[PDB]
Scaffold this active site. Sequence first.
Site, PDB file in Angstrom:
ATOM      1  N   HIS A  59       0.742  -1.206   0.155  1.00 34.01           N
ATOM      2  CA  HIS A  59      -0.063  -0.152  -0.097  1.00 34.01           C
ATOM      3  C   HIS A  59       0.858   1.218   0.070  1.00 34.01           C
ATOM      4  O   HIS A  59       0.479   2.288   0.495  1.00 34.01           O
ATOM      5  CB  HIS A  59      -1.012   0.097   1.191  1.00 34.01           C
ATOM      6  N   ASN A 102      -7.350   0.948   2.486  1.00 38.22           N
ATOM      7  CA  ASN A 102      -6.762   0.512   1.244  1.00 38.22           C
ATOM      8  C   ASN A 102      -6.918   1.701   0.094  1.00 38.22           C
ATOM      9  O   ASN A 102      -8.034   2.276   0.110  1.00 38.22           O
ATOM     10  CB  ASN A 102      -7.648  -0.694   0.632  1.00 38.22           C
TER      11      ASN A 102
HETATM   12  C1  LIG Z   1      -0.955  -7.629  -4.922  1.00 44.48           C
HETATM   13  C2  LIG Z   1      -2.172  -7.316  -3.990  1.00 44.48           C
HETATM   14  C3  LIG Z   1      -2.678  -6.037  -4.278  1.00 44.48           C
HETATM   15  C4  LIG Z   1      -3.779  -5.469  -3.377  1.00 44.48           C
HETATM   16  C5  LIG Z   1      -4.437  -6.116  -2.508  1.00 44.48           C
HETATM   17  C6  LIG Z   1      -3.947  -7.643  -2.186  1.00 44.48           C
HETATM   18  C7  LIG Z   1      -2.825  -8.133  -2.823  1.00 44.48           C
HETATM   19  C8  LIG Z   1      -2.474  -9.598  -2.680  1.00 44.48           C
HETATM   20  N1  LIG Z   1      -5.605  -5.787  -1.869  1.00 44.48           N
HETATM   21  C9  LIG Z   1      -5.905  -4.642  -2.160  1.00 44.48           C
HETATM   22  C10 LIG Z   1      -7.117  -4.185  -1.467  1.00 44.48           C
HETATM   23  O1  LIG Z   1      -7.981  -5.130  -1.017  1.00 44.48           O
HETATM   24  N2  LIG Z   1      -7.571  -2.833  -1.672  1.00 44.48           N
HETATM   25  C11 LIG Z   1      -6.894  -2.224  -2.489  1.00 44.48           C
HETATM   26  O2  LIG Z   1      -7.387  -1.020  -2.501  1.00 44.48           O
HETATM   27  N3  LIG Z   1      -5.611  -2.431  -2.817  1.00 44.48           N
HETATM   28  C12 LIG Z   1      -5.342  -3.781  -2.770  1.00 44.48           C
HETATM   29  N4  LIG Z   1      -4.188  -4.267  -3.467  1.00 44.48           N
HETATM   30  C13 LIG Z   1      -3.329  -3.280  -4.216  1.00 44.48           C
HETATM   31  C14 LIG Z   1      -4.147  -2.711  -5.613  1.00 44.48           C
HETATM   32  O3  LIG Z   1      -3.873  -3.971  -6.082  1.00 44.48           O
HETATM   33  C15 LIG Z   1      -3.114  -1.566  -6.073  1.00 44.48           C
HETATM   34  O4  LIG Z   1      -3.363  -0.362  -5.311  1.00 44.48           O
HETATM   35  C16 LIG Z   1      -3.703  -1.167  -7.700  1.00 44.48           C
HETATM   36  O5  LIG Z   1      -3.591  -2.231  -8.652  1.00 44.48           O
HETATM   37  C17 LIG Z   1      -2.760  -0.116  -8.022  1.00 44.48           C
HETATM   38  O6  LIG Z   1      -3.216   0.323  -9.413  1.00 44.48           O
HETATM   39  P1  LIG Z   1      -2.210   1.066 -10.504  1.00 44.48           P
HETATM   40  O7  LIG Z   1      -3.101   0.863 -11.523  1.00 44.48           O
HETATM   41  O8  LIG Z   1      -1.962   2.443  -9.764  1.00 44.48           O
HETATM   42  O9  LIG Z   1      -0.932   0.012 -10.646  1.00 44.48           O
HETATM   43  P2  LIG Z   1      -0.951  -1.549 -10.826  1.00 44.48           P
HETATM   44  O10 LIG Z   1      -1.885  -2.173 -10.457  1.00 44.48           O
HETATM   45  O11 LIG Z   1       0.700  -1.977 -10.238  1.00 44.48           O
HETATM   46  O12 LIG Z   1      -0.566  -1.578 -12.329  1.00 44.48           O
HETATM   47  C18 LIG Z   1       0.421  -0.789 -12.872  1.00 44.48           C
HETATM   48  C19 LIG Z   1       0.931  -1.398 -13.994  1.00 44.48           C
HETATM   49  O13 LIG Z   1       1.940  -0.664 -14.816  1.00 44.48           O
HETATM   50  C20 LIG Z   1       2.852  -1.798 -15.586  1.00 44.48           C
HETATM   51  N5  LIG Z   1       4.038  -1.216 -15.453  1.00 44.48           N
HETATM   52  C21 LIG Z   1       5.183  -0.825 -14.836  1.00 44.48           C
HETATM   53  N6  LIG Z   1       6.105  -0.381 -15.360  1.00 44.48           N
HETATM   54  C22 LIG Z   1       6.024  -0.253 -16.513  1.00 44.48           C
HETATM   55  C23 LIG Z   1       6.789   0.274 -17.634  1.00 44.48           C
HETATM   56  N7  LIG Z   1       8.125   0.910 -17.594  1.00 44.48           N
HETATM   57  N8  LIG Z   1       6.130   0.568 -18.847  1.00 44.48           N
HETATM   58  C24 LIG Z   1       5.113   0.001 -19.197  1.00 44.48           C
HETATM   59  N9  LIG Z   1       4.032  -0.603 -18.258  1.00 44.48           N
HETATM   60  C25 LIG Z   1       4.766  -0.695 -16.782  1.00 44.48           C
HETATM   61  C26 LIG Z   1       2.715  -2.982 -14.797  1.00 44.48           C
HETATM   62  O14 LIG Z   1       2.980  -4.062 -15.697  1.00 44.48           O
HETATM   63  C27 LIG Z   1       1.143  -2.811 -14.560  1.00 44.48           C
HETATM   64  O15 LIG Z   1       0.112  -3.806 -14.881  1.00 44.48           O
END
Ligand SMILES: *Cc1cc2c(cc1C)nc1c(=O)[nH]c(=O)nc-1n2C[C@H](O)[C@H](O)[C@H](O)COP(=O)(O)OP(=O)(O)OC[C@H]1O[C@@H](n2cnc3c(N)ncnc32)[C@H](O)[C@@H]1O
EC number: 1.1.3.10
Lengths: 52, 577, 577, 104
Positions: free
Chosen positions: C506, C551
């Site tokens: 988080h 969260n």
């Molecule tokens: C892992 C997890 C997360 C989680 C959770 C339980 C687990 C086991 N429970 C949650 C919950 O109950 N409530 C909640 O609010 N959050 C919870 N989480 C966290 C949540 O999943 C994250 O806060 C959320 O997914 C964040 O969203 P965001 O869209 O900001 O980012 P992401 O999901 O990490 O996706 C980012 C993407 O960008 C890509 N990427 C990364 N680097 C690059 C570069 N250089 N170029 C192009 N793409 C890139 C990733 O691959 C990714 O898909």
Amino acid sequence: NVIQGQLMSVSVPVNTLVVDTLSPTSWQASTFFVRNGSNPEQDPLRNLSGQA
Amino acid sequence: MDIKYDVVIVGSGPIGCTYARELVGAGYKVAMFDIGEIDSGLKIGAHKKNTVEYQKNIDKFVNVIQGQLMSVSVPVNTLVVDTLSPTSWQASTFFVRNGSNPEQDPLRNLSGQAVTRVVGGMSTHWTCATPRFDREQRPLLVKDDADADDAEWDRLYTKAESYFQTGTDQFKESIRHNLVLNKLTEEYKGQRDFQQIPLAATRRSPTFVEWSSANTVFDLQNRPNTDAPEERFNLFPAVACERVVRNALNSEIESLHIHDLISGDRFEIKADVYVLTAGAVHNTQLLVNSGFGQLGRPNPANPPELLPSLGSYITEQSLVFCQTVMSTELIDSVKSDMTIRGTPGELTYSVTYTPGASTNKHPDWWNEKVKNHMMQHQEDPLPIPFEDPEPQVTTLFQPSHPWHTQIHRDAFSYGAVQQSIDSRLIVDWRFFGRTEPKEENKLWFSDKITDAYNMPQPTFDFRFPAGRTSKEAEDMMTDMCVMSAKIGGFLPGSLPQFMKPGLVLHLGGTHRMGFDEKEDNCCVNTDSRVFGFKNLFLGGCGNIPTAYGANPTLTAMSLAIKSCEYIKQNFTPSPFT
Amino acid sequence: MDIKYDVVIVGSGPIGCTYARELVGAGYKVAMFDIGEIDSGLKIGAHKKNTVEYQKNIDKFVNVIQGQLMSVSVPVNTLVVDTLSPTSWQASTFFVRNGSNPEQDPLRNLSGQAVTRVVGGMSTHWTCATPRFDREQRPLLVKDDADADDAEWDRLYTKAESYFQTGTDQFKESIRHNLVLNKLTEEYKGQRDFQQIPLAATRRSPTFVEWSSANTVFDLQNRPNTDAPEERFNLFPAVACERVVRNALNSEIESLHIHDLISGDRFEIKADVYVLTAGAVHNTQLLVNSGFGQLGRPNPANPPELLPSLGSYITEQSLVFCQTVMSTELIDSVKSDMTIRGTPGELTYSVTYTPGASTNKHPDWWNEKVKNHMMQHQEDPLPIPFEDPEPQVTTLFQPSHPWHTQIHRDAFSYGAVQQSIDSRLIVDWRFFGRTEPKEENKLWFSDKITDAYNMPQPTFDFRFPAGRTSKEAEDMMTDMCVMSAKIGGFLPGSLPQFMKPGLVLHLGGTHRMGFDEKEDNCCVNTDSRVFGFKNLFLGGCGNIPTAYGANPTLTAMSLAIKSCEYIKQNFTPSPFT
Amino acid sequence: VDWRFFGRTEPKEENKLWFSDKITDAYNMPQPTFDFRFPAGRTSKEAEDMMTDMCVMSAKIGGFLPGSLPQFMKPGLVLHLGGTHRMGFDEKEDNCCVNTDSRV
Ligand SMILES: *Cc1cc2c(cc1C)nc1c(=O)[nH]c(=O)nc-1n2C[C@H](O)[C@H](O)[C@H](O)COP(=O)(O)OP(=O)(O)OC[C@H]1O[C@@H](n2cnc3c(N)ncnc32)[C@H](O)[C@@H]1O
Ligand SMILES: *Cc1cc2c(cc1C)nc1c(=O)[nH]c(=O)nc-1n2C[C@H](O)[C@H](O)[C@H](O)COP(=O)(O)OP(=O)(O)OC[C@H]1O[C@@H](n2cnc3c(N)ncnc32)[C@H](O)[C@@H]1O
């Protein structure tokens, strides 16, 4: 270690742990028989397992 | 969805896809059902390890495997938890809890046996090793004519190798691979031959191998489509196939009863030909739920009407395992051709070799990789390049060493202490034994206990047979100890050990093939046709009736090919309407 | 592939999908890039737990989560292995091995921090908890007008909740849920309020909950398509976005440089608007790679030209956990309204209740499920139906209890001795603390060490701040111990404990929002626009500048909605030609 | 710092130590066997309240040491077994074996 060396368990139930990675050539039990000073009278769920 | 097809296939693993490939291509109207769902990206049924993330972090792939293996039969748990708070609800008995199977003798189980329910089946995660069986391990297809039998097997295996894109070249320029291969070759010169493990895979780059799968065999796209405008195929995921309906005469299947898991609807699906390729355990469950064999605890006083050998003579391979840490002598040998000047991290550091020198122990491509690694990474104490591929070595099953061997690296969950050892040093050793088929070794199905899909719960009654199987298993362990020592000592935490029975997932003989139902104690003939039934065929490792050590999928695929030849000669595709 | 768009979005998680939903819908020509690949089935970016197999076998899902969490910074390993064979190669130093980060102080890390690189990001596996922040946890969007600030946040949250399909009714008729809810409500009557955890999820049947994801927000299908013939959207998986190019005036972004992982090709992509939604770690990484902030170990002597607060003030929540085994008093209470005649297993056994009797402790629906379970499964010692859904209980963060709470079940890896306890008895407790933002808590990027995608290696310098944060964390632990005891004693092997720092995922504040760059020590304004740049916006938890326990994703989504409102007012979509 | 809190257990007739008429121990004596659970009611409530009390009190001093988290010990590991040959004023009325002079 001194303490552990002189505490002998009062009542140890028959062991029902499954060891299934023996070599096929090793002598293997068909039942959880009375082994290693275990007490077949003992209900394992109504014990004082820590009593020594 | 129609309810009428030329051919219906239960299961979308590589063996179902063998049926689909042959029969869709031959013009049949085909439907395939899988209890599991599409979850390998856009390539339906493809290998899950063919993502850039998993090629960069292969060890994480163990989790993918674990997440799709569900244990077949788990006995009632008798662990004592006596440190609960006195306020918590406490058991008076070891009751049936958490999906456990009270039918199961914990001391006669295949505790490691597991199943996968996803489109593509286990080929979405498998290690891709596709060796042929030698005669000693291989079922007969032609009786009393060794030449004809060999010829038939070579023809089938060659086609199967084509379907999987099997090759023995993908790791040919690995330094670790050659280090191990060359050392074992020399150590066993005149005694044993070593080669690359035959692998269903295509190298795409120095850092990416496209591992094969069901999708490689058949792309699982519905047809007609633009690439295949005259073909007819439909895949129906999240559909549980529950039974085949026998006619009164037990000469023909009349329909397949299915349960759509999304809508909840149930249908009867009609086809000219029914093919069961649900795996060695679930083909057996389906047949027993359909009135083949015997439901419930084996009872020899009441022999079954149909397929009395169904679910007897089951085989699973013994598996021994360890890991080693490469010897100092072998590591130093990697840089044997190098002249080293200066001190690392200083300006005067120089690593050079004379290409072509006849005094060179290694070829130029090897020395070039070593030189560059050593010159470009002077902090690093090892001569092996960081991106050097893993070893993939085997000495195949022979009479004098009747086990299959893999000397390699596959995905592994290293303990925190183990992660202390540089991965370049580590080699995995897996030796697989053959198990004699015995009538007493069985897979049976409860008449009361049901599994997660409300089907009769599978129960094992299994022990590795006394005699040759057990002697060989222990000799195999010793051979692994002896051979592995030539490469390095054991890695702490991965000491030589038998794996839990069935964790190997090479279960065979549950619905075994033979020439004669009675004389060969079998369920299907050499066309994979269920005896007595015109239009019912089984595919998979369950057909294999022999004691085998090598990985069985290629042999199962070969049998399925032959089965398809029969189908093509005995059933006519519908005109495309 | 053209290289010209109205809007480009980096990252396909739920926050990039919020921008896509808004701006694709508003008629903009949008491209979206993700370094990861499509791998949730046909519904691109969907929750991986939405398979029949994972809803029957929920505990297996922990493997899916583990397989797509890659640790951000792993320090050099110093474990001593001194039981190697003398022939094995062995280390003289603890050298840089196995992807470890030698920049990382093992004692100032977030060792649990990890990233996910798959289409849909972490929303393909998350727990779907979507609480609103109260004022205390929430950044200001309007100054000096609390009512206006509340009104804006209500508008935004309400829209976010609609995008996520957030609800509080999906577990209303669970026996275990209400057993726990009612007990806690009574124990804290007049002191704290309990409700269902707000969940992004839609129940589809008594046994299936469709958990929300990025896909829920935006289906990620290329457009124009049949359902959206006048929209324009392309998703490009397996594309590493490496840098944004700044103009000489540091007022505008001129292009996004990308690297296609499949072809190996590099391209400069042009757009009117650039949106970075790569996650809290990787947005920071891309920005630092593009000349924002400072590369390398923090050096206050040498001031960054742009965004001097980037990667400082980082926050991660403290997390405490235990499991409990339901009390005998609560379990007996489930059957309080039953009259039980006779002996289980016998003909005469009878379990009856009187529907609607005013002295019943439980509603009819409850009593009917208990009656049927006890009458149909007379072998079972518990009154809770086998398919009863899990509890999903919270008391939300308040000043007198400044932590978020989840009293529930989510995917969990039980040891064999814990597997001994019936799952119906088990409840998970997770309390999440708020962390004060401190300049000294930093995420920085090495100028020498690189990660698996050849990008500057992330490094943490983090400790939970002294003072309020630490006091609250420990009070939170004691709170969990006190509250959980009302339900049952701890489960052995799941005793009360702090989880490794960052395992919660988080992480906030890496690219924090404020009103004034200097006064509020921040990187984006309240439209999520990077200060000084006309056309660069950041989305995600990295924006959140406050100390929060709840969260964060719903809050991050709300901020993205507000950001899109600015983009729509300030940029014109290209004509659709 | 170590924290050990010890509860009191209500004497109940059903909680027994008995000896096998067939199984023998290392000294060829009748094998001891327990039939024991912590009584419902006060004993159980108190044991759990005691746990909570330890959690609350110990927090004043420091947080828990990983690997030594709050737990019940295996029954009888304490070695404070009582009441096997219990004292009282009257054999029958006080359900006992020795008088207040410890005389059988
Ligand atoms: C892992 C997890 C997360 C989680 C959770 C339980 C687990 C086991 N429970 C949650 C919950 O109950 N409530 C909640 O609010 N959050 C919870 N989480 C966290 C949540 O999943 C994250 O806060 C959320 O997914 C964040 O969203 P965001 O869209 O900001 O980012 P992401 O999901 O990490 O996706 C980012 C993407 O960008 C890509 N990427 C990364 N680097 C690059 C570069 N250089 N170029 C192009 N793409 C890139 C990733 O691959 C990714 O898909
Ligand atoms: C898991 C595994 C397997 C594996 C291996 C390593 C791992 C960790 N390495 C191997 C290797 O190097 N070489 C080799 O030859 N095999 C190795 N394997 C085993 C291999 O994957 C299997 O032998 C192979 O996949 C078997 O193929 P088959 O097509 O016969 O069976 P399947 O893949 O199990 O697919 C069966 C499908 O049918 C479905 N199903 C099951 N029950 C039903 C019902 N009732 N209704 C409809 N469909 C059903 C499944 O969901 C499944 O997908």
